[PDB]
């Protein structure tokens, strides 16, 4: 319907296909060192089993955490607003945004930022690219850029992903570990792994709905983001849950068709453990931070 | 009206229910991951097991 939450379902689940595509994934094994976040995941890997106390194995996810951490300090950059062009000091927001021009609409820029310099009387060009095939050369941006390029990025190393919208606008990244049968909350944008309670505890965020969305489904996962779930509840004023429930039930159902059974049967074996996370609300937590 | 009473219009639950009720093996599995995430409430399942089981078979749309 009109909504927009529903409206956003269908352009995510859309969206997301275009991670699972060789040909961009190739392009972005060309950015990564997987070589050394794989290697450098091995020697964590062999010491953690010396306090064997430490109980998993963890291997892929020694490598998620190298993923992570990588893509911060080597790979993608934070734009507050963009340096001037002319003179590379400080600029400021203009609210009217750039109409885009031409080539930022074909890498899927709807809205551009004004990042004027008063100095240099100079608009500088902040675009906003949906298009994660330009945000291997871009290699900047915000939570969208960063969650979209990270999404991209796990499944260009076999990895099981999600793109994560949180309405209250923020998005992220979620990860399966074999290792630990279940999903992971990963946070590119902010350095943080499994640890879902970092908005809502962390941050003071009054969340609503969160929705994840890969190849594979679309999955309501909001529930592993708070431990105030009647509060949740009373902002989830924009549609009805059944209407809601019923729109991802049909998404997962006619996108599930051309999976395999054994496929589908092991989504259906792991949706258990997540619906019963869903239903377990942990209890209300300083170090979300360090 | 139980202890559980609160968790039957739940959304999260809402789907556990549709899930069960179409896939019915998965019911041992359900109660197994239930006592690992959630001991608490794998008790409160057991003081009071057909309230529970009534409730997850009850037809939602
Ligand atoms: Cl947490
Ligand atoms: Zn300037
Ligand atoms: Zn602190």
Redesign the interface.
């Given at each position: 319907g009109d909504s927009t939450i529903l409206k956003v379902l269908q352009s995510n689940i859309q969206h997301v296909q275009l991670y699972e595509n060789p040909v961009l994934q190739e392009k972005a094994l060309t950015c990564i060192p997987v070589s050394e976040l794989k290697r450098k995941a091995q020697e964590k890997l062999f010491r953690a089993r010396k306090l064997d106390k430490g109980t998993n194995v963890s291997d892929e996810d020694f490598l998620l955490l190298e993923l992570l951490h990588w893509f911060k300090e080597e790979f993608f950059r934070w734009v507050n607003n963009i340096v001037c062009s002319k003179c590379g000091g400080e600029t400021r927001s203009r609210d009217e945004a750039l109409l885009p021009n031409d080539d930022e609409l074909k890498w899927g820029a709807k809205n551009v930022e004004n990042h004027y310099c008063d100095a240099c009387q100079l608009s500088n060009r902040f675009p906003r690219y949906n298009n994660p095939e330009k945000l291997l050369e871009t290699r900047c941006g915000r939570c969208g850029e960063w969650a979209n390029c990270f999404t991209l990025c796990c499944r260009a190393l076999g990895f099981e992903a999600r793109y994560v919208w949180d309405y209250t606008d923020h998005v992220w990244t979620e990860v399966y570990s074999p290792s630990q049968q279940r999903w992971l909350h990963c946070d590119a944008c902010e350095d943080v792994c499994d640890k879902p309670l970092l908005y809502e505890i962390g941050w003071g965020k009054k969340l609503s709905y969160i929705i994840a969305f890969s190849k594979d489904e679309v999955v309501?996962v909001?529930?592993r983001y708070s431990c105030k779930?009647d509060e949740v509840?009373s902002r989830?004023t924009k549609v009805k849950?059944?209407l809601?429930?019923?729109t991802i039930?049909g998404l997962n159902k006619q996108r599930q068709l051309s999976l395999s059974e054994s496929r589908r049967k092991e989504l259906?074996?792991r949706?258990?453990?997540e619906?019963?996370?869903?239903?377990?609300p942990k209890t209300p937590h300083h170090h979300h931070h360090h | 009206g139980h202890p559980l009473e609160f968790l039957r219009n739940q959304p999260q639950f809402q789907q556990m229910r549709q899930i069960i009720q179409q896939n019915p093996s998965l019911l041992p599995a359900l109660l197994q991951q239930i006592g690992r995430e959630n001991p608490q409430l794998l008790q409160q399942i057991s003081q009071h097991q057909e309230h529970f089981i009534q409730m997850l078979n009850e037809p939602v749309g």
């Open positions: 309501d909001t529930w779930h509840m989830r849950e059944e809601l429930r019923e039930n259906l074996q949706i258990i453990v619906l019963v996370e869903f239903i377990s | -």
